[PDB]
Amino acid sequence: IQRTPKIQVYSRHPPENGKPNFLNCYVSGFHPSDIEVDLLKNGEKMGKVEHSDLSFSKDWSFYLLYYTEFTPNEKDEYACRVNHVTLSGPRTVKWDRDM
Amino acid sequence: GSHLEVQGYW
Protein backbone atom coordinates (compact mmCIF):
# COMPACT_ATOMS: atom_id res chain seq x y z
CA ILE A 1 0.00 0.00 0.00
CA GLN A 2 2.50 2.64 1.18
CA ARG A 3 1.40 5.82 2.96
CA THR A 4 3.49 9.00 3.12
CA PRO A 5 4.33 10.32 6.58
CA LYS A 6 2.90 13.56 7.91
CA ILE A 7 5.36 15.54 9.99
CA GLN A 8 4.95 18.13 12.72
CA VAL A 9 7.95 19.76 14.40
CA TYR A 10 7.09 21.77 17.50
CA SER A 11 7.96 22.64 21.10
CA ARG A 12 6.31 21.19 24.20
CA HIS A 13 5.77 24.68 25.64
CA PRO A 14 5.36 28.07 23.94
CA PRO A 15 8.95 29.07 23.11
CA GLU A 16 10.83 31.85 24.87
CA ASN A 17 14.40 32.57 23.74
CA GLY A 18 16.88 31.31 26.34
CA LYS A 19 14.27 29.23 28.18
CA PRO A 20 14.83 25.44 28.29
CA ASN A 21 12.14 23.53 26.42
CA PHE A 22 11.47 20.30 24.57
CA LEU A 23 11.69 19.72 20.83
CA ASN A 24 9.25 17.25 19.30
CA CYS A 25 8.93 15.71 15.87
CA TYR A 26 5.68 13.80 15.50
CA VAL A 27 5.62 11.62 12.40
CA SER A 28 2.36 9.87 11.55
CA GLY A 29 0.19 8.23 8.91
CA PHE A 30 3.02 6.23 7.31
CA HIS A 31 3.27 2.65 6.05
CA PRO A 32 5.27 0.44 6.12
CA SER A 33 6.64 1.07 9.62
CA ASP A 34 10.29 1.25 8.56
CA ILE A 35 11.35 4.87 8.88
CA GLU A 36 14.29 7.08 9.82
CA VAL A 37 13.85 10.29 11.82
CA ASP A 38 16.49 12.74 13.08
CA LEU A 39 16.39 16.04 14.95
CA LEU A 40 18.94 18.53 13.61
CA LYS A 41 20.36 21.79 14.92
CA ASN A 42 21.96 24.01 12.30
CA GLY A 43 21.89 21.07 9.90
CA GLU A 44 23.65 18.65 12.25
CA LYS A 45 22.13 15.74 14.16
CA MET A 46 21.54 16.65 17.81
CA GLY A 47 23.31 14.80 20.60
CA LYS A 48 20.63 12.78 22.35
CA VAL A 49 17.45 12.08 20.41
CA GLU A 50 15.04 9.40 21.61
CA HIS A 51 11.61 8.24 20.47
CA SER A 52 8.36 6.63 21.58
CA ASP A 53 7.45 2.99 20.99
CA LEU A 54 5.84 2.27 17.62
CA SER A 55 2.05 2.44 17.80
CA PHE A 56 -0.81 3.05 15.37
CA SER A 57 -4.16 4.76 14.86
CA LYS A 58 -7.63 3.58 13.88
CA ASP A 59 -6.81 3.49 10.16
CA TRP A 60 -3.73 1.36 10.89
CA SER A 61 -1.36 4.26 10.14
CA PHE A 62 1.68 4.28 12.42
CA TYR A 63 2.91 7.19 14.52
CA LEU A 64 6.13 7.94 16.37
CA LEU A 65 7.35 10.85 18.45
CA TYR A 66 11.05 11.74 18.32
CA TYR A 67 12.24 14.24 20.90
CA THR A 68 15.12 15.99 22.62
CA GLU A 69 15.71 18.93 24.95
CA PHE A 70 16.28 22.32 23.34
CA THR A 71 16.58 25.97 24.31
CA PRO A 72 15.24 28.15 21.47
CA ASN A 73 17.06 31.28 20.30
CA GLU A 74 17.01 33.71 17.37
CA LYS A 75 20.20 32.58 15.63
CA ASP A 76 19.86 28.79 15.64
CA GLU A 77 17.78 26.66 13.28
CA TYR A 78 16.11 23.44 14.44
CA ALA A 79 14.62 20.82 12.12
CA CYS A 80 13.28 17.30 11.73
CA ARG A 81 14.55 15.09 8.91
CA VAL A 82 12.62 12.05 7.75
CA ASN A 83 13.47 9.23 5.36
CA HIS A 84 10.82 6.75 4.24
CA VAL A 85 10.31 4.48 1.21
CA THR A 86 7.55 6.82 0.00
CA LEU A 87 9.87 9.85 0.03
CA SER A 88 12.23 10.46 -2.89
CA GLY A 89 15.00 11.93 -0.77
CA PRO A 90 14.95 12.96 2.89
CA ARG A 91 12.27 15.47 3.79
CA THR A 92 13.34 18.23 6.17
CA VAL A 93 10.84 20.35 8.08
CA LYS A 94 12.22 23.37 9.93
CA TRP A 95 10.90 24.22 13.38
CA ASP A 96 8.78 27.36 13.18
CA ARG A 97 7.82 29.02 16.45
CA ASP A 98 4.53 30.05 14.79
CA MET A 99 3.46 26.39 14.39
CA GLY B 1 -2.69 -10.05 33.69
CA SER B 2 -4.26 -7.69 31.17
CA HIS B 3 -2.60 -9.37 28.18
CA LEU B 4 -5.05 -11.53 26.23
CA GLU B 5 -4.44 -15.18 27.12
CA VAL B 6 -6.45 -16.55 24.19
CA GLN B 7 -4.46 -16.79 20.96
CA GLY B 8 -6.23 -16.14 17.66
CA TYR B 9 -4.47 -17.99 14.85
CA TRP B 10 -5.22 -17.00 11.27
Partner: protein, 276 residues
Protein backbone atom coordinates in the same frame (compact mmCIF):
# COMPACT_ATOMS: atom_id res chain seq x y z
CA UNK C 1 -17.07 8.55 33.16
CA UNK C 2 -16.17 5.99 30.50
CA UNK C 3 -12.70 4.46 30.23
CA UNK C 4 -10.74 2.18 27.92
CA UNK C 5 -7.91 -0.32 27.94
CA UNK C 6 -6.30 -1.23 24.63
CA UNK C 7 -3.29 -3.17 23.41
CA UNK C 8 -1.56 -2.46 20.10
CA UNK C 9 0.62 -5.23 18.68
CA UNK C 10 2.78 -4.76 15.60
CA UNK C 11 4.80 -7.55 13.97
CA UNK C 12 7.11 -6.96 11.01
CA UNK C 13 8.96 -9.72 9.20
CA UNK C 14 12.48 -9.00 8.01
CA UNK C 15 13.79 -11.77 5.71
CA UNK C 16 17.52 -12.34 6.09
CA UNK C 17 17.51 -10.72 9.54
CA UNK C 18 16.02 -13.43 11.75
CA UNK C 19 12.64 -13.49 13.47
CA UNK C 20 9.95 -10.84 12.92
CA UNK C 21 10.10 -7.84 15.25
CA UNK C 22 7.22 -7.70 17.73
CA UNK C 23 6.18 -4.55 19.57
CA UNK C 24 3.34 -4.30 22.08
CA UNK C 25 2.10 -1.13 23.73
CA UNK C 26 -0.70 -0.91 26.27
CA UNK C 27 -2.89 2.11 26.97
CA UNK C 28 -5.45 3.10 29.55
CA UNK C 29 -7.40 5.84 27.81
CA UNK C 30 -4.70 8.05 26.26
CA UNK C 31 -1.97 7.02 28.70
CA UNK C 32 0.62 4.39 27.75
CA UNK C 33 1.45 2.14 30.69
CA UNK C 34 3.52 -0.74 29.27
CA UNK C 35 5.77 -1.68 26.36
CA UNK C 36 7.38 -4.85 25.08
CA UNK C 37 9.86 -4.85 22.19
CA UNK C 38 11.42 -8.09 20.96
CA UNK C 39 14.48 -6.06 19.86
CA UNK C 40 15.04 -4.59 23.33
CA UNK C 41 18.37 -5.64 24.85
CA UNK C 42 16.50 -7.84 27.34
CA UNK C 43 12.93 -8.23 26.01
CA UNK C 44 10.42 -7.99 28.85
CA UNK C 45 7.22 -6.11 29.59
CA UNK C 46 8.32 -2.72 30.97
CA UNK C 47 6.41 -0.09 32.96
CA UNK C 48 5.76 3.25 31.28
CA UNK C 49 3.54 4.70 33.99
CA UNK C 50 4.21 5.09 37.74
CA UNK C 51 0.86 3.58 38.71
CA UNK C 52 1.96 0.23 37.25
CA UNK C 53 5.66 0.25 38.16
CA UNK C 54 4.50 -0.82 41.60
CA UNK C 55 3.21 -4.21 40.42
CA UNK C 56 5.08 -7.14 41.95
CA UNK C 57 7.22 -9.70 40.06
CA UNK C 58 4.17 -11.87 39.25
CA UNK C 59 2.81 -9.14 36.99
CA UNK C 60 6.01 -8.68 34.99
CA UNK C 61 6.74 -12.38 34.64
CA UNK C 62 3.22 -13.10 33.43
CA UNK C 63 2.99 -10.06 31.13
CA UNK C 64 6.36 -10.97 29.64
CA UNK C 65 5.12 -14.53 29.07
CA UNK C 66 1.96 -13.29 27.37
CA UNK C 67 3.80 -10.76 25.20
CA UNK C 68 6.19 -13.49 24.03
CA UNK C 69 3.28 -15.85 23.33
CA UNK C 70 1.56 -13.07 21.36
CA UNK C 71 4.75 -12.58 19.33
CA UNK C 72 4.78 -16.34 18.61
CA UNK C 73 1.16 -16.20 17.48
CA UNK C 74 2.05 -13.30 15.20
CA UNK C 75 4.95 -15.23 13.65
CA UNK C 76 2.61 -18.16 13.01
CA UNK C 77 0.06 -15.77 11.49
CA UNK C 78 2.68 -14.20 9.22
CA UNK C 79 3.58 -17.67 7.90
CA UNK C 80 -0.11 -18.48 7.44
CA UNK C 81 -0.60 -15.21 5.55
CA UNK C 82 2.26 -16.09 3.21
CA UNK C 83 0.25 -19.23 2.45
CA UNK C 84 -3.14 -17.52 2.08
CA UNK C 85 -1.82 -14.80 -0.24
CA UNK C 86 0.76 -16.96 -2.04
CA UNK C 87 3.63 -14.66 -1.05
CA UNK C 88 7.39 -15.16 -0.90
CA UNK C 89 9.27 -15.47 2.37
CA UNK C 90 11.80 -13.04 0.92
CA UNK C 91 9.40 -10.11 1.15
CA UNK C 92 8.67 -8.13 4.32
CA UNK C 93 5.12 -8.13 5.74
CA UNK C 94 3.25 -6.50 8.63
CA UNK C 95 0.50 -7.51 11.02
CA UNK C 96 -1.21 -4.97 13.24
CA UNK C 97 -3.65 -6.00 15.95
CA UNK C 98 -5.58 -3.84 18.38
CA UNK C 99 -7.89 -5.17 21.05
CA UNK C 100 -9.45 -3.99 24.27
CA UNK C 101 -12.47 -2.99 26.33
CA UNK C 102 -14.48 0.07 27.35
CA UNK C 103 -15.65 0.22 30.96
CA UNK C 104 -18.94 2.10 31.21
CA UNK C 105 -19.94 4.37 34.12
CA UNK C 106 -22.24 1.60 35.38
CA UNK C 107 -19.19 -0.66 35.62
CA UNK C 108 -20.14 -3.06 32.84
CA UNK C 109 -18.68 -3.64 29.38
CA UNK C 110 -19.57 -0.73 27.10
CA UNK C 111 -17.68 -1.83 23.99
CA UNK C 112 -15.18 -4.45 22.86
CA UNK C 113 -12.42 -4.32 20.24
CA UNK C 114 -10.50 -7.00 18.36
CA UNK C 115 -9.29 -6.07 14.90
CA UNK C 116 -6.29 -6.64 12.68
CA UNK C 117 -4.73 -5.49 9.42
CA UNK C 118 -2.27 -7.27 7.16
CA UNK C 119 0.19 -5.07 5.26
CA UNK C 120 -1.74 -1.97 6.31
CA UNK C 121 -5.17 -3.12 5.14
CA UNK C 122 -8.11 -4.47 7.13
CA UNK C 123 -7.81 -8.22 7.63
CA UNK C 124 -10.40 -9.24 10.20
CA UNK C 125 -12.43 -7.48 12.88
CA UNK C 126 -14.92 -8.31 15.63
CA UNK C 127 -18.34 -6.83 14.85
CA UNK C 128 -20.45 -4.61 17.10
CA UNK C 129 -22.48 -7.63 18.22
CA UNK C 130 -19.31 -9.06 19.79
CA UNK C 131 -20.29 -12.39 18.21
CA UNK C 132 -19.46 -12.18 14.50
CA UNK C 133 -16.44 -11.20 12.40
CA UNK C 134 -16.03 -9.01 9.34
CA UNK C 135 -13.44 -10.54 7.01
CA UNK C 136 -12.01 -7.98 4.58
CA UNK C 137 -11.13 -10.50 1.88
CA UNK C 138 -11.16 -14.15 0.84
CA UNK C 139 -7.97 -14.85 2.77
CA UNK C 140 -9.51 -13.56 6.00
CA UNK C 141 -12.53 -15.79 5.39
CA UNK C 142 -10.34 -18.81 6.13
CA UNK C 143 -9.59 -17.23 9.50
CA UNK C 144 -13.27 -16.45 10.01
CA UNK C 145 -14.22 -20.08 9.46
CA UNK C 146 -11.47 -21.26 11.81
CA UNK C 147 -12.61 -18.87 14.53
CA UNK C 148 -16.25 -19.88 14.14
CA UNK C 149 -15.06 -23.47 14.48
CA UNK C 150 -13.13 -22.92 17.72
CA UNK C 151 -15.48 -20.44 19.42
CA UNK C 152 -12.85 -17.68 19.38
CA UNK C 153 -15.42 -14.87 19.66
CA UNK C 154 -16.97 -16.41 22.80
CA UNK C 155 -13.62 -16.96 24.53
CA UNK C 156 -12.53 -13.43 23.70
CA UNK C 157 -15.82 -12.18 25.13
CA UNK C 158 -14.93 -14.05 28.31
CA UNK C 159 -11.70 -12.05 28.39
CA UNK C 160 -13.54 -8.77 27.75
CA UNK C 161 -15.99 -9.31 30.60
CA UNK C 162 -13.34 -10.98 32.74
CA UNK C 163 -9.72 -9.87 33.09
CA UNK C 164 -9.97 -6.90 30.71
CA UNK C 165 -12.54 -5.07 32.82
CA UNK C 166 -10.97 -6.21 36.10
CA UNK C 167 -7.55 -4.90 35.18
CA UNK C 168 -8.99 -1.71 33.71
CA UNK C 169 -10.71 -1.08 37.07
CA UNK C 170 -7.57 -1.93 38.96
CA UNK C 171 -5.42 0.48 36.92
CA UNK C 172 -8.05 3.21 37.23
CA UNK C 173 -7.96 2.81 41.01
CA UNK C 174 -4.17 2.53 41.34
CA UNK C 175 -3.64 5.66 39.24
CA UNK C 176 -6.81 7.68 39.83
CA UNK C 177 -4.98 10.95 40.49
CA UNK C 178 -3.53 10.88 36.97
CA UNK C 179 -6.00 8.74 35.00
CA UNK C 180 -9.28 10.19 36.30
CA UNK C 181 -8.15 13.82 36.14
CA UNK C 182 -8.94 15.96 33.10
CA UNK C 183 -6.42 18.74 32.48
CA UNK C 184 -7.89 21.64 30.47
CA UNK C 185 -5.94 23.21 27.62
CA UNK C 186 -4.02 26.43 27.99
CA UNK C 187 -5.27 28.40 25.00
CA UNK C 188 -4.44 31.51 23.04
CA UNK C 189 -4.74 33.23 19.66
CA UNK C 190 -1.80 34.43 17.59
CA UNK C 191 -1.77 36.62 14.49
CA UNK C 192 0.62 36.20 11.55
CA UNK C 193 0.46 38.46 8.47
CA UNK C 194 0.38 36.58 5.15
CA UNK C 195 0.58 39.74 3.07
CA UNK C 196 -0.42 43.39 3.33
CA UNK C 197 -4.00 42.26 2.70
CA UNK C 198 -4.41 38.96 4.57
CA UNK C 199 -3.40 37.46 7.91
CA UNK C 200 -3.48 34.11 9.69
CA UNK C 201 -5.28 33.70 13.00
CA UNK C 202 -4.02 30.65 14.87
CA UNK C 203 -5.88 29.23 17.86
CA UNK C 204 -3.68 27.16 20.16
CA UNK C 205 -4.64 24.54 22.73
CA UNK C 206 -1.76 23.11 24.76
CA UNK C 207 -1.11 20.81 27.71
CA UNK C 208 -4.53 19.14 27.65
CA UNK C 209 -5.64 15.63 28.62
CA UNK C 210 -7.34 13.48 27.46
CA UNK C 211 -6.64 13.89 23.73
CA UNK C 212 -10.26 14.42 22.68
CA UNK C 213 -10.90 18.08 21.90
CA UNK C 214 -12.89 20.28 19.53
CA UNK C 215 -11.34 23.39 17.99
CA UNK C 216 -13.22 25.52 15.47
CA UNK C 217 -13.32 28.99 13.94
CA UNK C 218 -16.35 31.21 13.46
CA UNK C 219 -16.91 34.51 11.65
CA UNK C 220 -19.69 36.63 13.13
CA UNK C 221 -20.83 33.50 14.98
CA UNK C 222 -21.07 31.41 11.81
CA UNK C 223 -19.01 28.24 11.42
CA UNK C 224 -15.99 28.65 9.11
CA UNK C 225 -14.32 25.93 7.04
CA UNK C 226 -13.13 27.87 4.00
CA UNK C 227 -9.43 28.77 4.34
CA UNK C 228 -8.98 26.89 7.62
CA UNK C 229 -6.28 24.43 8.66
CA UNK C 230 -6.52 22.10 11.64
CA UNK C 231 -3.42 20.07 12.47
CA UNK C 232 -3.63 16.54 13.85
CA UNK C 233 -3.76 16.43 17.66
CA UNK C 234 -0.16 15.86 18.75
CA UNK C 235 1.63 14.65 21.90
CA UNK C 236 3.45 17.13 24.14
CA UNK C 237 5.96 14.47 25.13
CA UNK C 238 4.91 14.67 28.78
CA UNK C 239 1.58 12.86 28.61
CA UNK C 240 -0.36 15.91 27.44
CA UNK C 241 -1.67 16.81 23.98
CA UNK C 242 -1.71 19.85 21.68
CA UNK C 243 -3.67 21.17 18.73
CA UNK C 244 -4.03 24.35 16.73
CA UNK C 245 -6.48 25.60 14.13
CA UNK C 246 -5.80 28.51 11.80
CA UNK C 247 -7.83 30.63 9.41
CA UNK C 248 -6.68 33.13 6.80
CA UNK C 249 -8.72 36.32 7.03
CA UNK C 250 -8.89 39.70 5.28
CA UNK C 251 -6.85 42.32 7.12
CA UNK C 252 -9.25 44.43 9.17
CA UNK C 253 -11.78 41.68 9.81
CA UNK C 254 -9.86 39.94 12.62
CA UNK C 255 -12.25 41.08 15.38
CA UNK C 256 -15.17 39.26 13.79
CA UNK C 257 -13.46 35.88 14.20
CA UNK C 258 -13.76 33.69 17.29
CA UNK C 259 -12.08 30.42 18.20
CA UNK C 260 -14.22 27.85 20.00
CA UNK C 261 -12.70 25.15 22.19
CA UNK C 262 -14.44 22.18 23.82
CA UNK C 263 -12.67 19.87 26.27
CA UNK C 264 -13.60 17.63 29.22
CA UNK C 265 -11.29 19.64 31.48
CA UNK C 266 -13.11 22.92 30.83
CA UNK C 267 -16.02 23.96 33.10
CA UNK C 268 -17.44 25.88 30.16
CA UNK C 269 -16.60 25.88 26.44
CA UNK C 270 -14.20 28.67 25.42
CA UNK C 271 -14.78 31.63 23.13
CA UNK C 272 -11.44 33.25 22.29
CA UNK C 273 -10.40 36.23 20.19
CA UNK C 274 -7.14 37.71 19.02
CA UNK C 275 -6.00 39.92 21.90
CA UNK C 276 -3.31 42.19 20.45
Amino acid sequence: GSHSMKYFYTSVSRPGRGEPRFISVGYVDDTQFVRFDSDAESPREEPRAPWVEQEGPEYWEEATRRAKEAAQTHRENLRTALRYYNQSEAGSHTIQKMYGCDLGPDGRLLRGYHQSAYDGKDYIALNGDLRSWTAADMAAQNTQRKWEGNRYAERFRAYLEGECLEWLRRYLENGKETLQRADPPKTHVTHHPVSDHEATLRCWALGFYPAEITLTWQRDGEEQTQDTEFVETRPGGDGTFQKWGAVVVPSGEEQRYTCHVQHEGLPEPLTLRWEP
